[PDB]
Amino acid sequence: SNVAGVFYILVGGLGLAMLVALIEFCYKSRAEAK
Amino acid sequence: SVVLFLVSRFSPYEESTNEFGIFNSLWFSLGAFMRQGCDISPRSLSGRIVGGVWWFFTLIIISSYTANLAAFLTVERMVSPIESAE
Amino acid sequence: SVVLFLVSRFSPYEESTNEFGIFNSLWFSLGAFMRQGCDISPRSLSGRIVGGVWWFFTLIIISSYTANLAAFLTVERMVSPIESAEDLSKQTEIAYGTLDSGSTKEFFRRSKIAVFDKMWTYMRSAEPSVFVRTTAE
Amino acid sequence: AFTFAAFCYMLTLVLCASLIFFVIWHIIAFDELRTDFKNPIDQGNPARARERLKNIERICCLLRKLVVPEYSIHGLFCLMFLCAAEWVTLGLNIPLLFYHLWRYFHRPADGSEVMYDAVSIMNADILNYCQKESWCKLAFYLLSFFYYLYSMVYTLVS
Amino acid sequence: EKGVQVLLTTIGAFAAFGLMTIAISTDYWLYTRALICNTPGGLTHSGLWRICCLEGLKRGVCVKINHFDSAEYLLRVVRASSIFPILSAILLLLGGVCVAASRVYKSKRNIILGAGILFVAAGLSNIIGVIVYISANAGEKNHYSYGWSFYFGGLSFILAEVIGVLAVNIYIERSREAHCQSRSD
Amino acid sequence: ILIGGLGLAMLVALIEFCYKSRSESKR
Amino acid sequence: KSKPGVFSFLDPLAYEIWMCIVFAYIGVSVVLFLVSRFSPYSNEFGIFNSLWFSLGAFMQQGCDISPRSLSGRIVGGVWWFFTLIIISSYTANLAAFLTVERMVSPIESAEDLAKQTEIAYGTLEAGSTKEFFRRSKIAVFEKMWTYMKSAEPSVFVRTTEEGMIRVRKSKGKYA
Amino acid sequence: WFFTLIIISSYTANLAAFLTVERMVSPIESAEDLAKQTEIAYGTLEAG
Ligand SMILES: CC(C)CCC[C@@H](C)[C@H]1CC[C@H]2[C@@H]3CC=C4C[C@@H](O)CC[C@]4(C)[C@H]3CC[C@]12C
Numbered sequence A: 001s002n003v004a005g006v007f008y009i010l011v012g013g014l015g016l017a018m019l020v021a022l023i024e025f026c027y028k029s030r031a032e033a034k
Numbered sequence B: 001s002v003v004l005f006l007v008s009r010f011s012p013y014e015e016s017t018n019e020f021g022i023f024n025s026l027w028f029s030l031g032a033f034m035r036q037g038c039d040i041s042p043r044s045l046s047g048r049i050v051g052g053v054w055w056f057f058t059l060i061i062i063s064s065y066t067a068n069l070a071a072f073l074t075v076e077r078m079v080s081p082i083e084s085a086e
Numbered sequence C: 001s002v003v004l005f006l007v008s009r010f011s012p013y014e015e016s017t018n019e020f021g022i023f024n025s026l027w028f029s030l031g032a033f034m035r036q037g038c039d040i041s042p043r044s045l046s047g048r049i050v051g052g053v054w055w056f057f058t059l060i061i062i063s064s065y066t067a068n069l070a071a072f073l074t075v076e077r078m079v080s081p082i083e084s085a086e087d088l089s090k091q092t093e094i095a096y097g098t099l100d101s102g103s104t105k106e107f108f109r110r111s112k113i114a115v116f117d118k119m120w121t122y123m124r125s126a127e128p129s130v131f132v133r134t135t136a137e
Numbered sequence D: 001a002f003t004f005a006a007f008c009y010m011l012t013l014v015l016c017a018s019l020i021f022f023v024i025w026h027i028i029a030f031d032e033l034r035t036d037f038k039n040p041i042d043q044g045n046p047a048r049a050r051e052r053l054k055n056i057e058r059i060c061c062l063l064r065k066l067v068v069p070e071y072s073i074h075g076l077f078c079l080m081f082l083c084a085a086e087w088v089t090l091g092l093n094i095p096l097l098f099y100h101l102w103r104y105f106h107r108p109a110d111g112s113e114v115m116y117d118a119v120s121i122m123n124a125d126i127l128n129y130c131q132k133e134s135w136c137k138l139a140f141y142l143l144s145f146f147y148y149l150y151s152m153v154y155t156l157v158s
Numbered sequence E: 001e002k003g004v005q006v007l008l009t010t011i012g013a014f015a016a017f018g019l020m021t022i023a024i025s026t027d028y029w030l031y032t033r034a035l036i037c038n039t040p041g042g043l044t045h046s047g048l049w050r051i052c053c054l055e056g057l058k059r060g061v062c063v064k065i066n067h068f069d070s071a072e073y074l075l076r077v078v079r080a081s082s083i084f085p086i087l088s089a090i091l092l093l094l095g096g097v098c099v100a101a102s103r104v105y106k107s108k109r110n111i112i113l114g115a116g117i118l119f120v121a122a123g124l125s126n127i128i129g130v131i132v133y134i135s136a137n138a139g140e141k142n143h144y145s146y147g148w149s150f151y152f153g154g155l156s157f158i159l160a161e162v163i164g165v166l167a168v169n170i171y172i173e174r175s176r177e178a179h180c181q182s183r184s185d
Numbered sequence F: 001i002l003i004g005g006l007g008l009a010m011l012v013a014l015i016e017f018c019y020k021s022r023s024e025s026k027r
Numbered sequence G: 001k002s003k004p005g006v007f008s009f010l011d012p013l014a015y016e017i018w019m020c021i022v023f024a025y026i027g028v029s030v031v032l033f034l035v036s037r038f039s040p041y042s043n044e045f046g047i048f049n050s051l052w053f054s055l056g057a058f059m060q061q062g063c064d065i066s067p068r069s070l071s072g073r074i075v076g077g078v079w080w081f082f083t084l085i086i087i088s089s090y091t092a093n094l095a096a097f098l099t100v101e102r103m104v105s106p107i108e109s110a111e112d113l114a115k116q117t118e119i120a121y122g123t124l125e126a127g128s129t130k131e132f133f134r135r136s137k138i139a140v141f142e143k144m145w146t147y148m149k150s151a152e153p154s155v156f157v158r159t160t161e162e163g164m165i166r167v168r169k170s171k172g173k174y175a
Numbered sequence H: 001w002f003f004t005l006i007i008i009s010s011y012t013a014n015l016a017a018f019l020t021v022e023r024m025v026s027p028i029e030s031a032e033d034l035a036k037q038t039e040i041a042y043g044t045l046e047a048g
Helices: A004-032 B002-010 B022-033 B045-074 C002-010 C022-033 C045-074 C086-090 C103-109 C114-124 D004-038 D046-065 D067-083 D087-106 D124-157 E002-025 E070-081 E083-102 E112-137 E148-184 F002-026 G015-036 G047-058 G070-103 G110-115 G128-134 G139-147 G160-169 H002-024 H031-036
Strands: E030-034 E042-046 E050-053 E062-064
Touching (some): B002 B022, B002 B045, B045 C045, B045 G070, C002 F002, C045 F002, C045 G047, C045 G070, C045 H002, C103 C114, D004 D124, D046 D067, E002 E083, E002 E112, E002 E148, E083 E112, E083 E148, E112 E148, E148 G015, G047 G070, G070 H002, G110 G139
Antiparallel strands (some): E042 E050
16 A cells, blocks of 8 residues: 555556557558558 | 757767657666666767766665655654644 | 576577676676676576576665664664673673772682682783772772 | 575585586596497598597587586685685585696696697597596585585574 | 467466456455454455355355545445456456457458457456555454465466467467568569 | 575576577487 | 564565565566567567566666667656665665664663553562552652552462463563 | 765665654653753743
8 A cells, every 4th residue: 555656657657558559550550551 | 858869969979869869868867767777878078967967866866765765664753733723 | 607607608598608708797796786787688598597586686685784774873772792790701801800908809709609710810810900999090 | 594604505505516417418428439439440431530530529629618617616615615614514625626626737648738638538548537537526526415405404404 | 389379378368267257256355354243353254245254153144345535435436346357357358259250350460469458458457456455455453364366366367468478479470471471472 | 595596597507408409409 | 582584574565565566577578578569560579578677677787678669668667667666665664674673672670661551560469569669659669559550450460470470471561 | 886885875874864863853842851851951040
């Protein structure tokens, strides 16, 4: 309970990173597809 | 990060801005703050000055955080929200 | 350092021993212990195991040093070298003597307990005179 | 309880496996050398002679590259047992230390450039001496490993 | 090869889904002592929803857990709903389904990718649920311990991460094969 | 833990040595 | 003489924190591997080297490789923050432990026993000690007597062997 | 490197000492606190 905040922040950063990665992948694939 | 970016773009070592753009500048600064290392370190006197002062800042701040946390965990102090009627 | 050297020489990544000879192994270990970086890190699972355990060891030891030093500097504790009389007989750095021509010396002289016999031997074979002529002295 | 000597014993126990490995490699290489020697040494085919010579040279180079670690690691054992003030084990280990020192720094071979020399190697006397030395060293290392394990357990439990 | 890796991925998906469903439904997460046990209290084995007394007069009777400061309220809500472990199980199920589809639409390569993303996200959600559970249990009656359901959840997390790795590797190999074939053609 | 890790590293190095030797002798 | 346990160096942080540290390490490594090796856009961040990088990050050592993408750098940054907080907390709580263990002044006199109350002290029910305390004109023993006859329920005792047994059974809670 | 390690550890430790001690400080708030301590002297009017 003392350090739950860093765990929440870390998991949020992981989810954000995965989302950014998928966004870049879709955008790049669409761009290279044209 | 911004000052490192500027100093490395318009006063490069002579190339020297493909390294230490804004993104890599932010990365270098973050790695410095967290006591990690660096895949790049500045070669110019101005970038090195920036890095040195950032390094000093990081050292002091991390030491202060650890020390004050040790204080907190060593001495319990419960403050009453009220010490009067007003 | 030795285990890293062996593991990297006879089970190399495949070259891998011109890096992580004994000299560079010692250097890597030292840089690890001092929380610095490394111009080389192992690529094989065995060398990486060695490095990981060394890293854990270093982290724990540095944290312990800093913490116990903080304890030392926060709490002053002055220990008396002596908490009894046997401790005083065993010690030779500290000198002890009574008042000369008194009842205390007469007690130590005619004693039968071992510790006080040893003290009497010391006081009789002591240079300069441990004894004294007055209490204030 | 845990102490400096027990940690020294643990570390020496871990490092003696390496010495066992080295001596086992020695005896395997010398068994191969014997298979090459006792087997007919006819060199009528230039290709066969070249292959045999290069095999001998390779094995000699391997053995030379592999000797210093053994001796220096045993010296490390001796130094550790000196600093920890474990006198009995240091006494048991000094004779092998001096034997290794003598062996490395004498070069009884008249060439006196390498401990093992391809030209001097293939000699039956030298081959057999090396084989016997390796076997005795393996026995000694096994015994010392078990002694170190016993001493470690003894020091821990007490 | 690819076939064995896909087989391991599907087996891991099924196993992780089963383990997590078992852990959620099961009520052997925490062994502790509670005041409401009919005699600091009596031994209890609990879970996510209900608590059962053992070694007591009311032995075998299981009763729904009585949950209940904005952050504390949100934590209590999340712990009660147990939405994170349930989401982990759901995502594992969907990932296994996507893998099975990848066993059919061998052309579409962006399926065994969704499977891996879902498995990794399920592992993250399981981490979050574990953190929430542990945080909520604490308050401010000792010598407590964790049961085999908790470790079933942990095993589910580990398996999900492993099979996500395998699925991503499969996607890598498949995309590499297709791209090299196309470029060389 | 340090001693255990060192021993495990030696063991894994031996395993890798045997594996690589066999794969190379195949080549 | 409290024999410190092996793995007492883990005491500053609870078992749950170490468990979740391991879990977060695995998750971080997997997410790094994924977000580095998914897009057919090379990268040295496989699953082995992702684990290596994460481990080295946790120990504040750093390794040869470092991320170059936005997602990988987000992951590395949050992992770095987590590592910093956790290591600082470990060091600080260990310092707290040792400092407190260094403050501890045992009982060495009647005053030390008198002021504190975490330990109970009582003498024989009938005897010269009870009378001595009752009929005392001294400050410290007056305070003791004021405490004495309290709701231990019974600090007093009937037999001396009873007092010795009670002290032996009590885990330092009786004097 | 050794010098740096020792110096940084000493800085952190002594700073922790400073802050911890500054956190122990309980001022005077009653007659008892004044009574036990002696670092401060207290006296009233000669006649009164
Ligand atoms: C301590 C160990 C490891 C090495 C040194 C031990 C000595 C005593 C060993 C090493 C090699 C040994 C020799 C090897 C070969 C032979 C065969 C024959 O000619 C009789 C004994 C003789 C000559 C051995 C005598 C003992 C010997 C000299």
